Amino acid sequence: SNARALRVLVDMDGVLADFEGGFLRKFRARFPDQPFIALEDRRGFWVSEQYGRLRPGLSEKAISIWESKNFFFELEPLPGAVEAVKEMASLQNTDVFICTSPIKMFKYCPYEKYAWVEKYFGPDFLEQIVLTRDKTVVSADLLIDDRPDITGAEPTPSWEHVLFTACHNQHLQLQPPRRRLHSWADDWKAILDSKRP
Amino acid sequence: SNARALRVLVDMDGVLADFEGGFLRKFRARFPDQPFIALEDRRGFWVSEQYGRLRPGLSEKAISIWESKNFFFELEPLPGAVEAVKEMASLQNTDVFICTSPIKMFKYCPYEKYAWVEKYFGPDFLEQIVLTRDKTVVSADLLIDDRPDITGAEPTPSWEHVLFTACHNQHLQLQPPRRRLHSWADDWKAILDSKRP
Numbered sequence: 221s222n223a224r225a226l227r228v229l230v231d232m233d234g235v236l237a238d239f240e241g242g243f244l245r246k247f248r249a250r251f252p253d254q255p256f257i258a259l260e261d262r263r264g265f266w267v268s269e270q271y272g273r274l275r276p277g278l279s280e281k282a283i284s285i286w287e288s289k290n291f292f293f294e295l296e297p298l299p300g301a302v303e304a305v306k307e308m309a310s311l312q313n314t315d316v317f318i319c320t321s322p323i324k325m326f327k328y329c330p331y332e333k334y335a336w337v338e339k340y341f342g343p344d345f346l347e348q349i350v351l352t353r354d355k356t357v358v359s360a361d362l363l364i365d366d367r368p369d370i371t372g373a374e375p376t377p378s379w380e381h382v383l384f385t386a387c388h389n390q391h392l393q394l395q396p397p398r399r400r401l402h403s404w405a406d407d408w409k410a411i412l413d414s415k416r417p
Numbered sequence: 418s419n420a421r422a423l424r425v426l427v428d429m430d431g432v433l434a435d436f437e438g439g440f441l442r443k444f445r446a447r448f449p450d451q452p453f454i455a456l457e458d459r460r461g462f463w464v465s466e467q468y469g470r471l472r473p474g475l476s477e478k479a480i481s482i483w484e485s486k487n488f489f490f491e492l493e494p495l496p497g498a499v500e501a502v503k504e505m506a507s508l509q510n511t512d513v514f515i516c517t518s519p520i521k522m523f524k525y526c527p528y529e530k531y532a533w534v535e536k537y538f539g540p541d542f543l544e545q546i547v548l549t550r551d552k553t554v555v556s557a558d559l560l561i562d563d564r565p566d567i568t569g570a571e572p573t574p575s576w577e578h579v580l581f582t583a584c585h586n587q588h589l590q591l592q593p594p595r596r597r598l599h600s601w602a603d604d605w606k607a608i609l610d611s612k613r614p
């Protein structure tokens with residue numbers, strides 16, 4: 221709730237919305253005779269790069285899944301994500317924004333992201349959405365995001381990046397003092413509190 | 418062009434895209450027997466508030482114009498806006514973002530804004546779009562925006578707000594040392610240069 225309040229940026233894909241599980245389900249359904257990558261075997265952020273190494277033409281097939289209508293809208297929430305962010309947003313002196321990078325193909329993705337937030341968080345939460353391909357230009361105390369490398373036009377972002385665990389990043393050793401949020405069952409309140417006055 | 422580079426946030430509606438002229442044209446076409454507000458007579462940011470005072474029911478009719486499909490996509494560029502922002506983005510040590518607040522009705526507006534940027538600035542400029550209802554949380558040196566009151570979660574934004582003239586704001590006296598950009602024919606380079614090292 222508004223105050224300066226602690227400000228927390230929460231990524232959407234891979235943190236609130238299950239991009240990896242939604243991708244794999246739809247990929248197997250559309251392309252049942254192709255090999256695939258089980259979630260536990262995912263390595264590196266870019267799904268299409270790993271699929272491309274697996275078999276020729278598979279990167280293009282992977283791309284076709286996230287470019288399809290309803291891909292973003294039908295993503296399931298990660299366990300605990302909706303409950304956690306609703307609680308977080310209700311805390312005194314705590315402003316939460318959903319800070320999400322849309323894909324370059326804009327026909328469906330931006331729309332569906334707004335629709336997804338309305339569905340799980342309600343109309344009033346639409347005010348908290350920030351769509352950007354550059355998260356470094358958004359100022360905050362924290363950014364909770366599963367991508368290891370968050371870069372852009374601002375060389376010294378104001379936020380601390382807390383790495384949200386995903387299969388693709390779970391084995392990565394981080395440079396101290398970088399830290400993680402393992403899942404929404406993990407103690408996110410303690411991380412927020414560590415940044416408060 | 419990227420470097421820290423000077424960072425300039427450029428509003429879309431009322432700065433790049435002619436919201437006021439597009440509104441009036443479509444309003445008169447859809448509601449030809451209703452009274453309207455000539456552009457020179459516009460006062461205050463909120464179109465529907467002025468229309469509402471004019472005749473009962475007119476606020477709802479005004480709303481219906483911007484909620485309609487193709488309202489945002491069919492807005493015309495302001496004179497000089499496309500040429501100015503293309504030149505600005507090409508300057509050394511200058512990063513330009515289009516920082517735009519979408520309407521709450523999300524069915525068409527976000528999509529159409531991406532489509533509009535692709536149309537006038539090209540695919541590569543889609544990387545520079547930031548959609549947010551809170552511009553105070555976006556850090557930059559400058560924000561060029563026609564709204565007089567730009568507020569949100571950050572009480573001390575990093576940017577200087579340069580007020581872009583519109584009919585609705587043209588008579589407003591600003592508190593020194595606030596300043597204006599009168600139009601894209603005005604000397605925007607001098608304003609950028611005043612913020613450089």
Ligand SMILES: O=c1[nH]c(=O)n([C@H]2C[C@H]3O[C@](c4ccccc4)(P(=O)(O)O)OC[C@H]3O2)cc1/C=C/CP(=O)(O)O
Pocket residue numbers: 231232233234239265266267268286319320321322323324325353367
């Ligand atoms: O987690 C992801 N995993 C993944 O495999 N992809 C796919 C979709 C498509 O996304 C992109 C992409 C790059 C940068 C930002 C957002 C999206 P695209 O360049 O095709 O749009 O990159 C190549 C493709 O990789 C994107 C993402 C993006 C997440 C957005 P986030 O960082 O805000 O959570």
Ligand SMILES: O=c1[nH]c(=O)n([C@H]2C[C@H]3O[C@](c4ccccc4)(P(=O)(O)O)OC[C@H]3O2)cc1/C=C/CP(=O)(O)O
Pocket residue numbers: 428429430431436462463464465483516517518519520521522550564
């Ligand atoms: O210039 C405008 N003039 C105007 O009359 N309106 C209308 C459309 C609709 O927009 C809103 C609005 C409020 C705040 C941010 C963006 C949009 P909405 O609350 O209905 O979405 O407000 C009431 C309505 O007023 C919006 C704008 C918004 C511009 C967005 P910007 O500040 O990024 O240029």
Ligand SMILES: [K+]
Pocket residue numbers: 368369370381
């Ligand atoms: K990082």
Ligand SMILES: [K+]
Pocket residue numbers: 565566567578
């Ligand atoms: K202001």
Ligand SMILES: [Mg+2]
Pocket residue numbers: 231232233234235365366367
């Ligand atoms: Mg992510």
Ligand SMILES: [Mg+2]
Pocket residue numbers: 428429430431432562563564
């Ligand atoms: Mg404006």
